[PDB]
């Protein structure tokens, strides 16, 4: 599924994104943006072999298990392809694991270099939530 911009932030909303660990809803909505345009199938191939999943991009070296990431782990307990559904619910459930484990949302490379200490309130603007 490829959301609008203001029905992932409802959606993120009511699976408790907002504020969670202090980041306002804004940056998430600007983090899936970047990772994944939006598109709950979006899949991308990392140089050391290990796949990107969904709308948050969630890497098989750690977070979920697709069967071809040798000596990889599975800390979200989940196959990678349930990260895909339209459903974002496993997806944001395993975000809540990465975004406490340590490293805030630095985790996430693209928020890093294009959300980090800019204005993200602008990508919720305008939505009824
Ligand atoms: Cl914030
Ligand atoms: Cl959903
Ligand atoms: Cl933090
Ligand atoms: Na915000
Ligand atoms: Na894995």
Same mark, same amino acid.
Request: proline letters at 2%.
């Given at each position: 599924?490829?959301?609008? %911009?203001? @029905?992932?932030?409802?959606?993120?909303?009511?699976?408790?994104?907002?504020?969670? %660990?202090?980041?306002?809803? *804004? &940056?998430?909505? #600007?983090?899936?943006?970047? @990772?994944?345009?939006?598109?709950?199938?979006?899949?991308?191939? &990392?140089?050391?072999?290990?796949?990107?999943? *969904?709308?948050?991009?969630?890497?098989?070296?750690?977070?979920?298990?697709?069967?071809?990431?040798? *000596?990889?782990?599975?800390?979200?307990?989940?196959? #990678?392809?349930?990260?895909?559904?339209?459903?974002?619910?496993?997806?944001?459930?395993?975000?809540?694991?990465?975004?406490?484990?340590?490293?805030?949302?630095?985790?996430?490379?693209?928020?890093?270099?294009?959300?980090?200490?800019?204005?993200?309130?602008?990508?919720?603007? *305008?939505? %009824?939530?």
């Amino acid at each position: 599924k490829v959301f609008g %911009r203001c @029905e992932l932030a409802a959606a993120m909303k009511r699976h408790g994104l907002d504020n969670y %660990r202090g980041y306002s809803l *804004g &940056n998430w909505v #600007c983090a899936a943006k970047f @990772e994944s345009n939006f598109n709950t199938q979006a899949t991308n191939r &990392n140089t050391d072999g290990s796949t990107d999943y *969904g709308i948050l991009q969630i890497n098989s070296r750690w977070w979920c298990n697709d069967g071809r990431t040798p *000596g990889s782990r599975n800390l979200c307990n989940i196959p #990678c392809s349930a990260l895909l559904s339209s459903d974002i619910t496993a997806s944001v459930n395993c975000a809540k694991k990465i975004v406490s484990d340590g490293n805030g949302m630095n985790a996430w490379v693209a928020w890093r270099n294009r959300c980090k200490g800019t204005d993200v309130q602008a990508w919720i603007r *305008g939505c %009824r939530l």
